[PDB]
Structures are given as C-alpha cells and as structure tokens.
Design an enzyme around this catalytic site. Structure first.
Site, PDB file in Angstrom:
ATOM      1  N   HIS A  39      10.027  -8.450  -7.992  1.00 43.69           N
ATOM      2  CA  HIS A  39      10.616  -9.417  -8.917  1.00 43.69           C
ATOM      3  C   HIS A  39      12.086  -9.010  -8.936  1.00 43.69           C
ATOM      4  O   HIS A  39      12.971  -9.835  -8.713  1.00 43.69           O
ATOM      5  CB  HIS A  39      10.025  -9.318 -10.337  1.00 43.69           C
ATOM      6  N   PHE A  89      16.866 -17.260  -5.757  1.00 46.45           N
ATOM      7  CA  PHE A  89      16.294 -16.182  -6.551  1.00 46.45           C
ATOM      8  C   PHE A  89      16.979 -14.850  -6.237  1.00 46.45           C
ATOM      9  O   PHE A  89      17.299 -14.081  -7.144  1.00 46.45           O
ATOM     10  CB  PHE A  89      14.789 -16.098  -6.280  1.00 46.45           C
ATOM     11  N   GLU A  93      19.179 -12.572  -8.833  1.00 48.39           N
ATOM     12  CA  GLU A  93      18.922 -11.167  -9.125  1.00 48.39           C
ATOM     13  C   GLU A  93      20.132 -10.309  -8.763  1.00 48.39           C
ATOM     14  O   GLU A  93      20.469  -9.369  -9.483  1.00 48.39           O
ATOM     15  CB  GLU A  93      17.675 -10.686  -8.375  1.00 48.39           C
ATOM     16  N   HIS A  97      21.710  -8.600 -11.902  1.00 44.51           N
ATOM     17  CA  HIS A  97      21.369  -7.183 -11.918  1.00 44.51           C
ATOM     18  C   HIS A  97      22.051  -6.358 -10.832  1.00 44.51           C
ATOM     19  O   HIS A  97      22.547  -5.265 -11.095  1.00 44.51           O
ATOM     20  CB  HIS A  97      19.855  -7.037 -11.788  1.00 44.51           C
TER      21      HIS A  97
HETATM   22  O1  U2P Z   1      14.783  -5.108 -19.260  1.00 43.55           O
HETATM   23  C1  U2P Z   1      14.863  -6.315 -19.058  1.00 43.55           C
HETATM   24  C2  U2P Z   1      13.850  -7.270 -19.560  1.00 43.55           C
HETATM   25  C3  U2P Z   1      13.966  -8.631 -19.172  1.00 43.55           C
HETATM   26  N1  U2P Z   1      14.951  -9.070 -18.322  1.00 43.55           N
HETATM   27  C4  U2P Z   1      14.744 -10.494 -17.810  1.00 43.55           C
HETATM   28  O2  U2P Z   1      14.173 -11.497 -18.798  1.00 43.55           O
HETATM   29  C5  U2P Z   1      12.817 -12.058 -18.464  1.00 43.55           C
HETATM   30  C6  U2P Z   1      11.836 -11.715 -19.594  1.00 43.55           C
HETATM   31  O3  U2P Z   1      10.517 -12.225 -19.276  1.00 43.55           O
HETATM   32  C7  U2P Z   1      12.520 -11.260 -17.171  1.00 43.55           C
HETATM   33  O4  U2P Z   1      11.848 -12.125 -16.183  1.00 43.55           O
HETATM   34  C8  U2P Z   1      13.867 -10.813 -16.579  1.00 43.55           C
HETATM   35  O5  U2P Z   1      14.376 -11.943 -15.808  1.00 43.55           O
HETATM   36  P1  U2P Z   1      15.566 -11.937 -14.779  1.00 43.55           P
HETATM   37  O6  U2P Z   1      16.469 -10.787 -15.092  1.00 43.55           O
HETATM   38  O7  U2P Z   1      14.872 -11.463 -13.594  1.00 43.55           O
HETATM   39  O8  U2P Z   1      16.254 -13.013 -14.114  1.00 43.55           O
HETATM   40  C9  U2P Z   1      16.065  -8.248 -17.935  1.00 43.55           C
HETATM   41  O9  U2P Z   1      17.047  -8.629 -17.333  1.00 43.55           O
HETATM   42  N2  U2P Z   1      15.943  -6.890 -18.316  1.00 43.55           N
END
Ligand code: U2P
Length: 204
Positions: A39, A89, A93, A97
């Site tokens: 993910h 996607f 990410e 992140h």
């Molecule tokens: O520690 C954390 C917890 C959650 N998330 C993001 O928020 C969605 C919560 O289901 C998660 O799917 C995740 O989605 P995304 O970041 O991938 O796009 C974070 O960024 N950090």
C-alpha cells in the site's frame, strides 16, 4: 529533509479490498496475484502524527523507476476505479509520503519492494498452516504470531468487513527504521479495533 522517527510499511490483502461493498477495479495488467501487495511506505513520528507532502514540487518521474514498473504493477497495484496502470497511485504515495522519507525516488520504491519480499507474509502464514479460505476460520493470534516469527517483529493487523459481514485481514503494518535499513519494533501502533479474535483470510 525535516527527519522523522520511523516508517510504517503497509501491505494489504487485495482480496479484502475487492470483496467489500466498495468498488475495486483490477489493474490494466489484469487481476492481481493472490499475495500481499504494497500500500505504501510511510515516514511517521512517535507522537502518532506524521509529515506529508514535503515537496509539492517533486512530481513522480517514471523514467527513474522504468525497469521496476512491471514488478510494481504486480506488487504495488492500484485497485481503485476505474482500472489504471498504478502510476497515479505511485505518484500519490511518492508525493505524500516519499517526499518526506529522505530517500531518492528509486531508493524509495526499491525499499518498498525489498521489504515486501523480506516480510514474506504469504509464505510465513503458510508455514503456520494459515491459507486463504472463506469464513472467519483463523484466530487473530495465530496470524500475528506467524508473521512475527517470520519477520522477527510483531505486526499490527487492520481488519475490514466483507459483504457477508465477515471480519477479514485487510492490511498489515510493520515498522522500518528511519534509514530504511531493516524492520524494527514499532514504537507505536495505529488505534483501530476492527479485528475480532477470529477473522477471515479470503481467497482470490
Ligand atoms: O499513519 C498514517 C495513517 C493513515 N495515513 C493515510 O490515511 C488513510 C487512513 O485509512 C490511509 O489509507 C493512508 O492513506 P494514504 O497516505 O496512503 O494515501 C497516513 O498517511 N499515515
């Protein structure tokens, strides 16, 4: 880089994303393998918060991971609709992140791929006789311990519910040190509570 404390390495069980009430669309490459997929790799703080979108000027450059794309289409697919190749996607990410990880773009994706292989979730479960099948047939404990023995650290299990009302293993969280060198014990875990004592490990 502003630095962080550790990474949450998040993998998910594709089947549990597709057997719910929500919409799931297979990748442009077709139905994904019956194996845990990536993910994301998320930089996090020990205070429960985390940095995100650290460089809104650093778009994903596919050329840098060109040779990893075919593998990523299979180990890091997008199950969202409509069906896509996954680039959106991966871009998401990376921007949200990846830009906060202190890692170069290729290092970020390679790390995710490497840790998915190292964690070897599917096989660690098989070793403990835990295989995909319908119904809440497995204790949550057996699943956690099986992964723990194979990884050397305890995972955090996130569960969701299928159309039949069964609680199923949805995502598996493991922690990686800030230098992305190896798995570490999680300093903290998320605060969900959707996993019963008995859960389903749905087949594809
Ligand atoms: O520690 C954390 C917890 C959650 N998330 C993001 O928020 C969605 C919560 O289901 C998660 O799917 C995740 O989605 P995304 O970041 O991938 O796009 C974070 O960024 N950090």
């Amino acid at each position: 880089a502003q630095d962080f404390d550790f990474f949450y390495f998040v993998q998910q069980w594709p089947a549990s994303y597709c057997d719910t009430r929500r919409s799931c669309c297979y990748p442009t490459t077709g139905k994904p393998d019956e194996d845990f997929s990536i993910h994301g790799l998320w930089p996090n703080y020990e205070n429960g918060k985390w940095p995100q979108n650290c460089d809104r000027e650093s778009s994903l450059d596919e050329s840098e991971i060109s040779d990893l794309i075919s593998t990523m289409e299979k180990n890091w697919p997008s199950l969202a609709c409509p069906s896509s190749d996954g680039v959106r996607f991966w871009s998401h990410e990376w921007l949200k992140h990846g830009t906060c990880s202190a890692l170069g773009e290729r290092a970020y994706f390679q790390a995710a791929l490497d840790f998915r292989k190292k964690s070897n979730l599917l096989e660690n479960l098989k070793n403990a006789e835990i295989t995909p099948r319908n119904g809440e047939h497995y204790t949550l404990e057996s699943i956690k311990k099986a992964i723990e023995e194979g990884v050397g650290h305890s995972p955090y299990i996130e569960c969701n519910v299928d159309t039949q009302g069964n609680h199923q293993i949805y995502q598996v969280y493991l922690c990686v040190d800030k230098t992305a060198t190896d798995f570490i014990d999680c300093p903290i875990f998320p605060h969900g509570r959707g996993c019963g004592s008995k859960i389903e490990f749905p087949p594809f």
